[PDB]
Design a protein around this ligand. Structure first.
Ligand code: KR0
Ligand code: KR0
Ligand code: CA
Ligand code: NA
Lengths: 945, 432, 10, 146, 48, 99
């Protein structure tokens, strides 16, 4: 069945499970060519991103189809729709799989032969297969007990030279470190409470942020039961996972519980099997973003302030109305012990499969899948205004510029219901004729996906701390939503074989979709793959295996739901930092929806051509695999930006080609292999070339994916890679000299934003090593990704706050920007003269806050890194020690994940593996003070009975 | 107002250091064309009732006027066509000012006597007062043409025919229907007192003029300094300079008079205040008739309208009979000076867009000959009430702001959007 | 773009 | 593995200073003849970002002078070769025996601070004397101000 | 298996309910009666 | 004047039983003993939303009102553990006794 005409990679469960990760796919980061796998954050329960051969979908569905046995597994993401003010990520549908349950994962990277799975297989397939019952000794019980810690990996590198102040001057209530160079002298700080004030030495506390963090801790327990006969098998498993992350208190929390029971029974020509699985989850997120969020509050701390001294709330100076600074942040310990962001989900999925063999060469199969989920979010904020405003500095002493305005409390709750059903009807025919071999299978596929939720919210909490829809004197806000889409299709997959040497397969599939215009819902897509193992019938025996493959094929695709017709929404108006919605005042109103529909759309069509080679030498002691692919995604249906003066802000239409060409390359070999010792190396390499080819130019050939209003924005532009950033840049004279304001000394903005990079790695590769010696196992895996940029609010804040090491630049003495001029303009004769205006000490703060000489583009940070991804020390106890014991096998295990990261010198701020805008395309925009990545290490005990 | 010293949300508005890519208008452009003007197009497609069409046309015209007074050119005649023209050409402000004035005319003449059968939160189906809203906009635009010296002769006789008919609106043209809860407040309040923290402090021109005139209105919207209990304005774009000169500790919010948000939670949104209406007639009388007695009548109608709205009815005496009184003004220009300055006060905390545009048309308040740094060094040089070019000024040509950038959304998706000019180039009707 | 963003305090 | 913040070519002799102006009268040095008290002055690098010159800026507070002085960064000395153009107002100034002396001075709070000293003459000074500008680098605590 | 979970989560903690949270109920209660069904049958007895 | 409401309710019950049973015949007698632990947790919750006075008189959606919505939410949680024992004795398939 490796008559496959395109690249794929197979991983056995033993390697998936061995990293002891809560999730199936994050242990695979950097180990498979062409499979880009990254976590959104180190926050427990976060989503994972998986993107195969680059982005094709401009918004925003690039995850591979996960097919578990083999039924489409639902893999929807639950993350915050506003990552600037309240970023949270609650998880990814594939996370529910118990990794201990996996037998083999095959990842199919090719979109040439997709008739089996349909449209969603164009982003690739993750073909999981779960363990089955087996005969063995003795009782069939496997136990896995885990324990693990996490610590913070990379904090921003801080200046330790200047303490609390602004404009270079000493203040007692600043959120920033633009004060004087440290003396060691006795200064005042913080508010004054009851006619007394805190007075401490004016020295730096280099570890103040480092010591705020705890060690995360995580226990896990997995149990399985299996048995078989010669007619049946049964497998039943339980897994539990309890995570409390490094952020102090229980606010990083993830609890996972899974239960699963699968069985088969053959009777004659008939086999029936079923697999039914239940998954539970409770996440608690420490919300990120620019307001009274924890980390924003934490980064805006003077370098002389002890953070762990701020925790005791019986010290009145830490009480919220006397907290030392009032500048739009709060005590992080108060935010963590008093704000609620909670998620809970129960989920049931399973399949029924009936196989019936007849007439010697035919097999009928019916397979039904059902995936259903209910989730409940609960978010609350205390009503800070009525709790602390009158009587306090922070407080009515700050008036309209208080952090309690209008923090009047909020509480909401959402309940979400998802349910996918998939039905497969297949008859397969398979007969050898001479040395030839014919495999023919035709099938029907029905699919139905539905999601709905209801949402309700109250503001202005009467009793300030109680989060309950009853606790407000003001109107509630309610929302409800429902989507339903359906697909049917027939498909056929003919596979010819000659003498285990020449494999040639052709596919063909025509779908009908609800989400396309009625006049055009049928789309057809064929595909041809071939395979030829030339070492079979080439002597020696030095070429263990030699395979060459080719594929040419199309997959179709429909749109997202409800994009054909004009809608009227209930009239609302998005205004800076707020809305003005109807009803007013008693009247309700409907506005024409701001996205223009289209009844002329055609199906999406993805075309791909791929060649590849696979050779092995010296009894599989040296192997390589290489693939060359050329994928274009055409006519993709997208809500494309349009000039609002047309009447709409976007129009649904078919785009042009998004192209990904690239090379995937995998080389492994075992230099050393004796009886007791083996050493294997593995090197995989990927280089993908992203190019948008055309965006319908009648609307311009640019469209926003994600961006701040008048700030750094990521785009799709006609001739360029997906995800190019535009950012503000300094003006420059014809000679490359930086133009500077003749009075203040600070750089002048250019007319336009500058194109300042794309989101794409230029290349990404991994290097791995495995050593076995007498049942001792040692694995080391390195992940390398180089190229691309990413917005980093982590930097932006430590520049603005004056805590980054870069801001200690001219040792903060007034300075002229090197190589600076002034633009002298008299009506229309522009002339540049040498600048003699310095940045004053009082304005140094603003030179850095706006980004120095880069201006905004400074906060585009190089995405590159090398990571020591995972290390796994494993010890299979010698079987003789297990003799007067009930144990068949014991293996103790020590592992670390995400252990160390190296980055270019231009990035001393973040682990590039962060986001705030999800696990798909918009996540590449950057990180909006995501919580800092963690380093995880643990033990695992495996006991077989 | 200016930027409060201890926050930062509007540094670039204050120092004119914004650019086209700062999108300082992109939200408003969106909700004006893809919201207001599209719904108007559909209303026009769905009803055949003249009075509804009439009041709809007036709100459509009002939206075009706003855009034109921001960017001179605006889409029009080719806008609101969806996929038939996703890139509408930008008509010159003059072609749309004549256009929308033609539309109001055609719609008024279409009236038949039948009532409005539509929810009207401006006038509650009072056809008479939509008529007055439409004449008030004619007055407003007729005078734009005259001071732009474009067909001034005829628009001069129409503006006089308009004012002697006196067929204007009573009370104020406002959307008063906000509540102090959530997504239902005054937009400005919501954005600047709920969404953001306090960013606004009083500007120096306003505070020096109100305190010079001995005006009690100075307590409405403006609070005393917490440091000392006085009224202190900040010189335009001078936040960073006062901190440089006085030290960080002696130019905090404590030292400058804050804009008071508490009156704004449910405050209406004004399209045409009555004080402004009278001040425009007081101008037409004083300047195209020669009817001092009537000009003075409409001038005092203006001061006492605005005095009642802010809750100071009975106290217009303090600027009407106090010094800056219609008679301590000998030249006819000193009296037009009086009208424009009291129009300027009456528009604070009411209709700021219209204040700026009338500042551009009459160029009164004048621009001070003295720079921010000089005014700060010895205040005696400054005559209270005239504008001050920002201390740091991102306009290569200095002076005051004359127009707003084109929307970045229009720039990126409409090939025909006029090339970005600097904020110093005037709109088509500001000719001095 | 879309989505606001506030300056800090100092 | 420690990032160096950086700086311009004369970072350590650039600064904000609190100085007083003395004069040499009849050979002996008289304390502040102009009764001017402590004054604020800035030195800072040139746009050429050279190790060879540096701006000296009295900030309009004494004689209203601003000129480029020659610098030896290693010895932390600075002077002019004779009289140099004053860019502030069309005059000529001479800087002699200029030193920046690290951590050598003490602030009004009793704390070490960098000292600055330099002799100055002006070509429109009708009395033609040599003045001594001495001070310390400004801290940022308002207690150390004047 | 924590058994101390019998504080009703649907209603506030008894400490947090203060005199200003209870007092407006008194008039509204009295009004709902004497301006409702009492007012009603009294209108028949007074023969309105 | 119209009305529309929607409620989502969620129930969840867990039960756990840990028992050891012992069965031995002695002469004609028969003995069966059973000691066990029981643990139980029941939970219901719902959230409820309703709008009155429908703007579009036939469309049933929470957007279709110009008046205030009503929102209600409810949860209850109950738990219980127990220990138990059941002794059944038996003579000659003729007398049965259970405690
Ligand atoms: C050997 C029997 C094969 C029976 C095969 C059933 C074929 C219909 C699929 C179909 O037309 O569309 C599927 C899309 C959604 O289907 C549903 O929502 C589920 C409808 C209910 C299906 C119940 C299936 C019962 C299976 C025992
Ligand atoms: C040989 C295993 C014996 C396991 C015996 C576990 C006994 C404790 C139950 C308990 O104390 O109270 C039950 C109340 C509800 O239980 C839950 O909410 C469930 C809590 C989580 C229980 C997980 C059980 C996993 C079993 C595979
Ligand atoms: Ca924690
Ligand atoms: Na709209």
């Amino acid at each position: 069945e490796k008559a496959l005409g395109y690249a794929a990679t197979s991983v056995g469960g033993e390697k998936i499970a061995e990293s002891r990760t809560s999730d199936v796919m994050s242990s695979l980061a950097g180990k498979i060519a062409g499979v880009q796998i990254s976590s959104t954050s180190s926050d427990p329960g976060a989503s994972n991103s998986v993107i195969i051969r680059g982005v094709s979908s401009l918004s925003g569905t690039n995850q591979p189809l996960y097919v578990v046995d083999g039924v489409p597994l639902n893999n929807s993401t639950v993350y915050s729709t506003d990552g600037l003010n309240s970023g949270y990520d609650f998880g990814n549908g594939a996370n529910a799989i118990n990794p201990d349950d996996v037998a083999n994962m095959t990842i199919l990277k090719g979109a040439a032969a997709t008739a089996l799975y349909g449209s969603r297989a164009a982003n690739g397939v993750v073909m999981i297969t779960t363990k089955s019952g087996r005969k063995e000794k003795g009782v069939g019980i496997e136990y896995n007990g885990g324990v693990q810690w996490s610590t913070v990996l990379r904090l921003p590198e801080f200046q330790n030279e200047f303490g609390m102040g602004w404009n270079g001057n000493h203040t007692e209530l600043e959120n920033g470190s633009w004060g004087p160079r440290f003396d060691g002298s006795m200064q005042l700080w913080g508010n004054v409470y009851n006619n007394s004030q805190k007075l401490k030495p004016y020295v730096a506390m280099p570890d103040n942020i480092k010591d705020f963090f705890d060690a995360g801790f995580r226990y896990s327990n997995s149990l399985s039961f299996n048995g078989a006969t010669d007619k049946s098998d049964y497998y039943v498993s339980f897994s539990q996972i309890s995570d409390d992350g490094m952020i102090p208190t229980d606010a990083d929390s993830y609890d996972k519980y899974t239960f699963s029971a699968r069985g088969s029974h053959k009777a004659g020509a008939l086999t029936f099997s079923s697999s039914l699985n239940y998954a539970y989850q409770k996440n608690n997120f420490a919300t990120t973003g620019q307001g009274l969020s924890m980390l924003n509050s934490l980064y805006q701390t003077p370098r002389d302030i002890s953070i762990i001294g701020l925790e005791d709330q019986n010290d009145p100076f830490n009480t919220p109305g006397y907290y030392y600074t009032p500048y739009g942040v709060m005590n992080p310990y108060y935010i963590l012990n008093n704000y609620l962001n909670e998620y809970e989900s129960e989920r049931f999925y399973g399949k029924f499969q009936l196989d019936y063999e007849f007439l010697k060469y035919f097999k009928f199969t019916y397979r039904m899948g059902l995936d259903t989920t209910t989730g409940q979010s609960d978010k609350g904020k205390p009503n800070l205004y009525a709790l602390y405003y009158e009587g306090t500095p922070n407080g009515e002493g700050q008036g309209s510029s208080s952090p309690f305005s209008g923090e009047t409390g909020q509480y909401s709750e959402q309940i979400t219901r998802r349910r996918e059903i998939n039905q497969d009807i297949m008859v397969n025919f398979n007969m050898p004729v001479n040395d030839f071999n014919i495999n023919a299978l035709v099938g029907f596929n029905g699919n139905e996906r539905k999601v709905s939720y209801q949402y309700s919210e109250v503001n202005d909490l009467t009793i300030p701390t109680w989060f309950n829809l009853k606790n407000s004197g003001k109107t509630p806000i309610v929302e409800q939503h429902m989507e339903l889409r359906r697909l049917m299709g027939v498909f056929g997959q003919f596979e010819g074989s000659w003498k285990n040497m020449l494999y040639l397969t052709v596919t063909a599939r025509n779908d009908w979709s609800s989400t396309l215009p009625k006049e055009n819902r049928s789309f057809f897509y064929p595909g041809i793959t071939g395979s030829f193992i030339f070492s079979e019938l080439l002597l020696q025996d030095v070429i263990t295996f030699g395979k060459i493959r080719a594929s040419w094929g199309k997959t179709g695709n429909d749109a997202d739901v409800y994009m054909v017709n004009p809608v009227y929404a209930q009239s609302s108006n998005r205004i800076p930092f707020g809305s003005l919605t109807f009803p007013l005042g008693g009247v309700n109103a409907y506005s024409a929806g701001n996205v223009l529909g289209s009844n002329t759309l055609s199906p999406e069509m993805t075309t791909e051509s791929e060649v590849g080679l696979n050779m092995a030498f010296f009894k599989n002691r040296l192997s390589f695999d290489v693939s060359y692919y050329n994928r274009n995604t055409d006519k993709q249906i997208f809500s494309l930006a349009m000039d609002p003066a047309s009447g709409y802000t976007a129009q649904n239409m078919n785009l042009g080609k998004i192209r990904n060409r690239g090379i995937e390359l995998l080389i492994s070999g075992t230099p050393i292999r004796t009886k007791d010792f083996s050493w294997e190396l593995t090197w995989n390499f990927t280089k993908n070339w992203s190019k948008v080819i055309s965006l319908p130019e009648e609307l311009g050939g640019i469209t926003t994916i994600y961006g701040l209003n008048g700030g750094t924005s990521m785009y799709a532009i006609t001739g360029m890679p997906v995800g190019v950033f535009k950012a503000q840049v300094a003006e420059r004279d014809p000679q490359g000299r930086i133009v500077v304001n003749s009075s203040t000394g600070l750089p002048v903005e250019a007319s336009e934003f500058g194109i300042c990079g794309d989101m794409n790695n230029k290349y990404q590769m991994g290097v791995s090593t495995n050593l076995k010696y007498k049942g001792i196992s040692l694995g080391i895996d390195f992940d390398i990704r180089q190229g691309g940029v990413m917005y980093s609010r982590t930097k932006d804040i430590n520049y603005f706050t004056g805590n980054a090491i870069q801001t200690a630049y001219n040792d903060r003495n007034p300075l002229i920007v090197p190589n600076s001029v002034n633009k002298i303009v008299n009506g229309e004769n522009v002339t540049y003269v040498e600048n003699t205006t310095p940045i004053t000490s009082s304005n140094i703060y603003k030179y850095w806050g706006d980004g120095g000489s880069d201006m905004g583009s400074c906060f585009l940070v190089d995405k590159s890194y090398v990571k020591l991804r995972s290390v796994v020390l494993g010890w299979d106890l010698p079987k003789r020690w297990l003799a007067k014991t009930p144990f068949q096998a014991v293996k103790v295990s020590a592992y670390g994940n995400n252990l160390f990261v190296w980055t270019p010198s231009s990035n001393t701020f973040i682990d590039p593996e962060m986001t705030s805008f999800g696990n798909d395309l918009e996540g590449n925009y950057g990180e909006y003070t995501a919580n800092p990545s963690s380093r995880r290490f643990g033990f695992n005990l495996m006991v077989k009975f | 107002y200016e930027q409060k010293p201890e926050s930062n949300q509007y540094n670039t508005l204050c120092e004119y250091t914004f650019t086209e890519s700062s999108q300082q208008m992109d939200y408003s452009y969106r909700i004006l064309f893809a919201g207001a003007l599209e719904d108007a197009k559909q209303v026009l497609e769905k009803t055949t009732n003249p009075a509804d069409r009439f009041a709809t046309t007036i709100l459509r015209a009002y939206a075009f006027q706003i855009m034109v007074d921001n960017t001179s050119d605006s889409p029009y005649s080719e806008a609101l066509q969806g996929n038939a023209n996703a890139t509408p050409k930008w008509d010159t402000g003059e072609t749309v000012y004549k256009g929308i004035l033609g539309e109001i005319d055609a719609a008024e003449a279409a009236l038949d006597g039948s009532g409005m059968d539509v929810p009207d939160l401006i006038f509650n189906k009072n056809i008479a007062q939509w008529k007055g809203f439409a004449n008030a906009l004619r007055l407003r635009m007729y005078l734009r043409f005259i001071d732009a010296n474009i067909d001034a002769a005829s628009y001069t006789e129409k503006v006089k025919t308009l004012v002697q008919n006196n067929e204007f609106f009573t009370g104020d043209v406002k959307l008063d229907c906000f509540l102090d809860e959530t997504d239902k407040r005054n937009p400005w309040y919501n954005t600047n007192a709920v969404g953001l923290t306090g960013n606004h402090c009083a500007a120096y021109p306003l505070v020096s003029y109100l305190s010079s005139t001995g005006d009690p209105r100075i307590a409405y919207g403006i609070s005393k300094t917490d440091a000392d209990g006085k009224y202190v304005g900040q010189l335009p774009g001078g936040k960073t300079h006062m901190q440089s000169i006085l030290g960080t500790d002696n130019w905090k919010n404590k030292n400058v008079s804050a804009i008071d948000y508490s009156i704004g939670a449910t405050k209406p949104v004004y399209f045409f205040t009555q004080a402004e209406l009278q001040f425009l007639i007081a101008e037409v009388y004083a300047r195209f008739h020669n009817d001092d007695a009537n000009a003075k009548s409409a001038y005092e109608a203006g001061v006492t309208a605005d005095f009642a709205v802010r809750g100071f009815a009975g106290q217009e005496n303090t600027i009407l009979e106090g010094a800056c009184a219609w008679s301590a003004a000998s030249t006819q220009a000193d009296k037009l000076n009086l009208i424009y300055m009291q129009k300027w006060v009456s528009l604070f905390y009411m209709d700021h867009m219209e204040a700026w545009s009338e500042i551009r048309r009459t160029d009164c308040p004048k621009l001070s000959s003295y720079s921010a740094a000089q005014i700060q060094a010895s205040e005696s040089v400054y005559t209270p009430g005239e504008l001050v070019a920002p201390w740091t000024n991102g306009l290569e040509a200095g002076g005051l702001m004359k127009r707003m950038t084109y929307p970045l959304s229009a720039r990126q998706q409409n090939v025909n959007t006029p090339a970005g000019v600097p904020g110093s180039t005037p709109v088509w009707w500001d000719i001095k | 773009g879309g989505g606001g963003g506030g300056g800090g305090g100092g | 593995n420690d990032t160096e913040p950086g700086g311009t070519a004369v970072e350590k002799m650039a600064g904000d200073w609190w100085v007083t102006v003395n004069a040499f009268i009849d050979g002996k040095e008289v304390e502040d003849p102009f009764g001017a008290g402590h004054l604020q002055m800035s030195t800072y690098n040139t746009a050429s970002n050279s190790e060879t010159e540096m701006w000296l800026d009295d900030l309009g507070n004494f004689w209203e002078y601003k000129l480029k002085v020659n610098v030896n960064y290693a010895a932390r000395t600075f002077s002019t070769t004779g009289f140099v153009d004053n860019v502030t107002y069309e005059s000529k100034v001479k800087i002699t025996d200029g030193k920046v002396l690290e951590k050598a001075a003490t602030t009004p709070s009793g704390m070490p601070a960098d000292s600055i000293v330099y002799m100055v003459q002006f070509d429109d000074d009708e009395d033609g004397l040599t003045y001594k500008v001495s001070g310390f680098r400004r801290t940022g605590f308002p207690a150390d101000d004047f | 298996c924590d058994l101390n979970i019998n504080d009703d989560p649907n209603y506030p903690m008894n400490d947090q309910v203060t005199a200003d949270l209870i007092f407006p109920s008194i008039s509204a209660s009295i009004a709902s009666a004497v301006g409702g069904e009492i007012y009603n049958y009294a209108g028949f007895f007074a023969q309105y």
